[PDB]
């Protein structure tokens, strides 16, 4: 089997991407944030504290003839940005882009943190990291991809995120028309439960490529590119007037600037992030200070190849017995 679904930016900055997901019978379609940095499929629901729901579409398990309470199971998750959610668990039929999994754990939120409530466009998350990170207790549950894998034509999914435009998540096949050149594959460590890999270096604009190993994770659920402070300083040094602002929370730059590109290495291959992808707009409405899309990972404890990096590539998440990642230009 295969599936293919369009993923759409939630706003004009590509802060996140939402993909429609069919849950239950009859289908209830919710728009979920596909997150290769986590492993829970959780949704706003009829059980979510009413004051914490503000415009999201909810899953109502009592209206699904295939929903079953997973007795005794609870979940609770905290994300790298400080947000969190928790609740109980149902199993139900879940379909993405025509690919159906029966008996998928659907984690129904009883509580969500304020950042989720305040984002009316995201109805929940669909985790695509390794199932070892799933938070359901006392019986850990499998991700949608883990459940689908054996049925897929090939045990892979691909992320093709758009810049200021929709893109595609495919399951079970590699669309050879969706990228240019060849896909370069690189080794993955699953020891932390992430799609963790090692970039071979970077360049700023038209500058020389610096060969250096940068361990990090491919994370579709993180907006920005978080790299070591040395790398980030080298980038922003090429933007007149850019500086790190402790009060804003990262590097800012004059909105009048033209940003240089940023290149990262995948083996001997190179992925070029155009400068425009690194502009996250005014820090507050009407400001002439703009927020940068490349930020330091110091204090996060891991480097993160988030959407800024991934949307410059066609990315293969190869879930074979020994997983690997592939990157192609597009």
From Swiss-Prot:
Disulfide bonds join 255-290. It catalyses: Hydrolysis of proteins with specificity similar to that of pepsin A, prefers hydrophobic residues at P1 and P1', but does not cleave 14-Ala-|-Leu-15 in the B chain of insulin or Z-Glu-Tyr. Clots milk. It is an enzyme of class 3 (hydrolase). One of its GO terms (biological process) is proteolysis. The keyword Disulfide bond applies. The active site is at 35, 199. It comes from the Eukaryota. Residues 17-328 form the Peptidase A1 domain. The keyword Signal applies. Keywords: Aspartyl protease, Disulfide bond, Hydrolase, Protease, Signal, Zymogen. Its EC number is 3.4.23.22. One of its GO terms (molecular function) is aspartic-type endopeptidase activity. Belongs to the peptidase A1 family. This is Endothiapepsin.
């Amino acid at each position: 089997s295969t599936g293919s679904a369009t993923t759409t930016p939630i706003d004009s900055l590509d802060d996140a991407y939402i993909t429609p997901v069919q849950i239950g019978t009859p289908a209830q379609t919710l728009n979920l944030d596909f997150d290769t940095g986590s492993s829970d499929l959780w949704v706003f629901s009829s059980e979510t504290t009413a004051s914490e729901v503000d415009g999201q579409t909810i899953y109502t398990p009592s209206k699904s003839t295939t929903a079953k309470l997973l007795s005794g199971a609870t979940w609770s998750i905290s994300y790298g940005d400080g947000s969190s959610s928790s609740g109980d668990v149902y199993t139900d039929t879940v379909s993405v882009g025509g690919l159906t999994v029966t008996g998928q754990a659907v984690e129904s939120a009883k509580k969500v943190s304020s950042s989720f409530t305040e984002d009316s466009t995201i109805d929940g998350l669909l985790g695509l990291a390794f199932s070892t990170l799933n938070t359901v207790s006392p019986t850990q549950q499998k991700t949608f991809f883990d459940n689908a894998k054996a049925s897929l034509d090939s045990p892979v999914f691909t992320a093709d995120l758009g810049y200021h435009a929709p893109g595609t998540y495919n399951f079970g096949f590699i669309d050879t028309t969706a990228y240019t050149g060849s896909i370069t594959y690189t080794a993955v460590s699953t020891k932390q439960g992430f799609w963790e890999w090692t970039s071979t270096g970077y360049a700023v604009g038209s500058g020389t490529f610096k060969s250096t190993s940068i361990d990090g994770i491919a994370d579709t659920g993180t907006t920005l590119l978080y790299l070591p402070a040395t790398v980030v300083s080298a980038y922003w040094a090429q933007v007149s007037g850019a500086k790190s602002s402790s009060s804003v929370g990262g590097y800012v730059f004059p909105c009048s600037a033209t940003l240089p590109s940023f290149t990262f290495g995948v083996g001997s291959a190179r992925i070029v992030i155009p400068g425009d992808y690194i502009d996250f707009g005014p820090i507050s409405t009407g400001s002439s200070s703009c927020f940068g899309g490349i930020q330091s990972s110091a204090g996060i404890g891991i480097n993160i190849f988030g959407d800024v990096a991934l949307k410059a590539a066609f990315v293969v998440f190869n879930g074979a017995t020994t997983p690997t990642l592939g990157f192609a230009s597009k």
